[PDB]
Design an enzyme around this catalytic site. Sequence first.
Site, PDB file in Angstrom:
ATOM      1  N   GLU A   1      -4.560  -8.605  -0.621  1.00  0.00           N
ATOM      2  CA  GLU A   1      -5.096  -8.251   0.690  1.00  0.00           C
ATOM      3  C   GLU A   1      -6.474  -7.636   0.575  1.00  0.00           C
ATOM      4  O   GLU A   1      -6.664  -6.645  -0.121  1.00  0.00           O
ATOM      5  CB  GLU A   1      -4.187  -7.288   1.454  1.00  0.00           C
TER       6      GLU A   1
ATOM      7  N   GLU B   1       0.803  -1.233   0.000  1.00  0.00           N
ATOM      8  CA  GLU B   1       0.000   0.000   0.000  1.00  0.00           C
ATOM      9  C   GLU B   1       0.834   1.282   0.000  1.00  0.00           C
ATOM     10  O   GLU B   1       0.683   2.133   0.889  1.00  0.00           O
ATOM     11  CB  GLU B   1      -1.030  -0.009   1.122  1.00  0.00           C
TER      12      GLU B   1
END
Length: 390
Positions: free
Chosen positions: A229, A140
């Site tokens: 994820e 991320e």
Amino acid sequence: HMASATINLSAEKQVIRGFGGMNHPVWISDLTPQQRDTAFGNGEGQLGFTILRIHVDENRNNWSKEVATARRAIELGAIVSASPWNPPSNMVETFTRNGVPNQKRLRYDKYGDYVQHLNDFVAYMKSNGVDLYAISVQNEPDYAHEWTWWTPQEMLRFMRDYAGQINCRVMAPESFQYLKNMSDPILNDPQALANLDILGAHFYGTTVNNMPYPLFEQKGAGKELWMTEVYVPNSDSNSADRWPEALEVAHNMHNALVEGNFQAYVWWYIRRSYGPMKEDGTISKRGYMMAHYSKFVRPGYVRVDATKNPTYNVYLSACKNKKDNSVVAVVINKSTEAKTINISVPGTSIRKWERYVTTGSKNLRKESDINASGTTFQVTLEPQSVTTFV
Ligand SMILES: C[C@@H](O)[C@H](N)C(=O)O
């Protein structure tokens, strides 16, 4: 009162890599030995996961904590991918991002040192019997309030000029929401693309309309596509058994596979009160949703074209085992009414399907076989259910 669907075994789509979740023994408790088996075994009462995701700690003194769970996952047939959240602190510096100070990035003069850190992790895990399938540049990079930010151009420089030196498949960019701005520069640069092995993405807030990726269809030959994820629809405490909420998990997986062409779908923490395994070590309703795919759609199967939404509230995916041209169909019924579907599978010699059904009141319950009439399999889906046909 009779919907129709067709599964086309001759229209092959993506090869399935697998399904799984995250272990993180530094932030939470490691999986126990029995939980490792419940996660990565494929017996009754086990999730049948085939991918383990781990983190690359910024402090190498923590690396040994990953080994026991990763070894057992591999022994049970899984593959392992690793993602870093921060570089070692001596490689980081700060900047002010949208007026918020003290935000972290990798120093521009430390890109080579960071390559060496990642390679050191890969070598350490290899020495400990864990041959990583892939390692990621950054978890991320575009939602790094609490870790290390990378702009699209920083990611591009790394992928173009440094990632070729990594002794492993390279995964990137793991955007929190599959934002294409993070990955377009890699796909559009021949050298960066050559150094990419796996396009990794997360699905937090990703809508169906944002699951296709035309540029990846165009430029991604030879690259894998993994959803590395998510949790859905929330991380509410003690939510993992909520019903019919848990159907959202199956629907998100359906969507990843059919709308996104994803080859892998990886949850966040395996064991958690909103995860696929509850803190008591048993499978949650959310876990059974995952299991409807993971236990039956095994690595190496290939998704095939199939009527994806044959009637309102019904969602269908199908994957083929190329060894014998057998089919696994996963059918979600979100309706409060039962649905009967004539599923045509032209050209198959198969004449019987077994089925496993999850509802609010039963989990992967084996129900009566479906006997085809010619190449048509007439199935009835209970209200608010998922069925896997095999
Ligand atoms: C219209 C609605 O009442 C319908 N009979 C049902 O199946 O629920």
